[PDB]
Enzyme design. Structure first.
Site, short mmCIF file in Angstrom:
data_model
loop_
_atom_site.label_atom_id
_atom_site.label_comp_id
_atom_site.label_asym_id
_atom_site.label_seq_id
_atom_site.Cartn_x
_atom_site.Cartn_y
_atom_site.Cartn_z
N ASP A 198 0.83 -1.21 0.00
CA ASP A 198 0.00 0.00 0.00
C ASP A 198 0.86 1.26 0.00
OD1 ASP A 198 -2.48 -1.36 -0.03
OD2 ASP A 198 -3.24 -0.33 1.77
N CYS A 242 -2.26 0.61 -13.47
CA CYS A 242 -2.35 0.58 -12.01
C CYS A 242 -3.52 1.49 -11.67
CB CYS A 242 -1.02 1.01 -11.37
SG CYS A 242 -0.18 2.50 -12.13
N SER A 243 -3.40 2.40 -10.71
CA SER A 243 -4.52 3.32 -10.53
C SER A 243 -4.45 4.48 -11.53
CB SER A 243 -4.58 3.82 -9.09
OG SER A 243 -5.85 4.45 -8.88
N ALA A 244 -3.35 5.24 -11.55
CA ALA A 244 -3.23 6.34 -12.53
C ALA A 244 -2.56 5.91 -13.84
CB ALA A 244 -2.44 7.50 -11.91
N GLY A 245 -1.92 4.76 -13.88
CA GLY A 245 -1.22 4.32 -15.09
C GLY A 245 0.10 5.02 -15.38
N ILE A 246 0.83 5.47 -14.34
CA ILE A 246 2.12 6.13 -14.55
C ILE A 246 3.21 5.67 -13.59
CG2 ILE A 246 1.09 8.14 -15.60
CD1 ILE A 246 1.40 9.68 -13.00
N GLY A 247 2.85 5.23 -12.38
CA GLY A 247 3.84 4.88 -11.38
C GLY A 247 4.36 3.45 -11.43
N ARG A 248 3.64 2.51 -10.80
CA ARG A 248 3.92 1.07 -10.98
C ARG A 248 3.98 0.69 -12.46
NH1 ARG A 248 -0.43 -0.94 -6.31
NH2 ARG A 248 0.30 0.61 -4.77
N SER A 249 3.03 1.20 -13.24
CA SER A 249 3.00 0.89 -14.66
C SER A 249 4.29 1.32 -15.35
CB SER A 249 1.80 1.58 -15.32
OG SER A 249 0.55 1.06 -14.90
N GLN A 275 6.76 7.77 -10.27
CA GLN A 275 6.11 8.84 -9.51
C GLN A 275 6.91 9.31 -8.30
OE1 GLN A 275 2.24 6.67 -9.07
NE2 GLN A 275 1.33 8.72 -9.29
O1 LIG Z 1 3.66 14.28 -11.29
C1 LIG Z 1 2.67 14.97 -11.61
O2 LIG Z 1 2.69 15.99 -12.23
C2 LIG Z 1 1.29 14.51 -11.22
C3 LIG Z 1 0.20 15.34 -11.45
C4 LIG Z 1 -1.06 14.92 -11.12
C5 LIG Z 1 -1.28 13.67 -10.52
C6 LIG Z 1 -0.20 12.88 -10.21
N1 LIG Z 1 -0.40 11.53 -9.69
C7 LIG Z 1 -1.36 10.95 -8.88
O3 LIG Z 1 -2.28 11.58 -8.35
C8 LIG Z 1 -1.35 9.39 -8.69
C9 LIG Z 1 -0.67 8.47 -9.45
C10 LIG Z 1 -1.03 7.20 -8.94
N2 LIG Z 1 -1.83 7.38 -7.98
O4 LIG Z 1 -2.04 8.69 -7.88
C11 LIG Z 1 1.08 13.35 -10.61
#
Ligand SMILES: O=C(O)c1cccc(NC(=O)c2ccno2)c1
Ligand SMILES: O=C(O)c1cccc(NC(=O)c2ccno2)c1
Length: 294
Positions: free
Chosen positions: A181, A215-222, A262
């Site tokens: 988590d 994943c949830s946002a598709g940028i971190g784990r992904s 992320q």
């Molecule tokens: O880096 C950034 O500019 C950025 C901007 C908006 C949103 C986020 N990410 C999230 O809220 C998130 C990713 C996975 N779970 O939540 C990152």
């Protein structure tokens, strides 16, 4: 610099946050105008995570072709990926439409439906063989065929039917169920074992459309998944493996979707995974049987 010793140099100097901020400063900025149209507000999970216009996946539909999904095309490695957000209650039909239209074989899920006491994505696949799902807005039927639950992940076989043409296809669902988590895993051994299982299935190969990863946002784990995969492939392809520069590969992938990786902890974990994985590949085939024990 090489990777493993650049790694020890950042650890000893405690500069992961500064390295990661440099990446953020140098990353591409491209327009995402379609994502921000008012008619698409309930198609986005997070207001600050949007696909660039130039690389977004278009649905084959004349009313509204929008889905929060991006094509990451890696030219030298000869691999492509679709990175997308966890489906929303009002986009589960779009999600499976994309899988169908892009000819994907596999779906890679790196989150649980509920984490930290909140819903991170919709329950978008059926949990029982006899209770199939029908998506009326896109005219698709989805059936669970089989399910194999292991300690760190679950693999499901699914049948997707286009109800308009009665064509059917087999989709593989690869579900990594143990990412914590908070933070990142202490060892990359189970993540690498999971990556190799996806590879062994054919889901990443050129005879199919691009794998869909979320994943949830598709940028971190992904981002961690496709960065590790691509770096290891390049190390196998090149004459000099120590020429693979993980920061440069990450900046290349960020030309296609914003925000990949992320946190500085995710960056360090990506280094660890590539480093350990390069030992198991060789030529150390015995490396494999080791990931699966630990
Ligand atoms: O880096 C950034 O500019 C950025 C901007 C908006 C949103 C986020 N990410 C999230 O809220 C998130 C990713 C996975 N779970 O939540 C990152
Ligand atoms: O025409 C082709 O070469 C081609 C292209 C993309 C996809 C597929 N089919 C599948 O991936 C599949 C396997 C099981 N269900 O669908 C075939």
């Amino acid at each position: 610099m090489e990777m493993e010793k650049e790694f020890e140099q950042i650890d000893k100097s405690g500069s992961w946050a500064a390295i990661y901020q440099d990446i953020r400063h140098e990353a591409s900025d491209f327009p995402s105008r379609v994502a921000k149209l008012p008619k698409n507000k309930n198609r986005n999970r997070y207001r600050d995570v949007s696909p660039f216009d130039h690389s977004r996946i278009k649905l084959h539909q004349e009313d509204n072709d929008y889905i929060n999904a991006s094509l990451i095309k890696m030219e030298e490695a000869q691999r492509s990926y679709i990175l997308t957000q966890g489906p929303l209650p009002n986009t589960v039909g779009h999600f499976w439409e994309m899988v169908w239209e892009q000819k994907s074989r596999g779906v890679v899920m790196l989150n649980r439906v509920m984490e930290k006491g909140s819903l991170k994505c919709a329950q978008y696949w059926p949990q029982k063989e006899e209770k199939e799902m029908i998506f009326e807005d896109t005219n698709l039927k989805l059936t669970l065929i089989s399910e194999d639950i292991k300690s760190y992940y679950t693999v499901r076989q699914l049948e997707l039917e286009n109800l308009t043409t009665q064509e059917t296809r087999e989709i593989l669902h690869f579900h990594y169920t143990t990412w914590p988590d908070f933070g990142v895993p202490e060892s990359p051994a189970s993540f690498l074992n999971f990556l190799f299982k996806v590879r062994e299935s054919g889901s990443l190969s050129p005879e199919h459309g691009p794998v869909v990863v979320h994943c949830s946002a598709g940028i971190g784990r992904s981002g961690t998944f496709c960065l590790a995969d691509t770096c290891l492939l390049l190390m196998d392809k090149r004459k000099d493996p120590s020429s693979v520069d993980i920061k440069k590969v990450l900046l290349e992938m960020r030309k296609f979707r914003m925000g990949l990786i992320q946190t500085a902890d995710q960056l360090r974990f990506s280094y660890l995974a590539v480093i350990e994985g390069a030992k198991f590949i060789m030529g150390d085939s015995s490396v494999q049987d080791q990931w699966k024990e630990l």
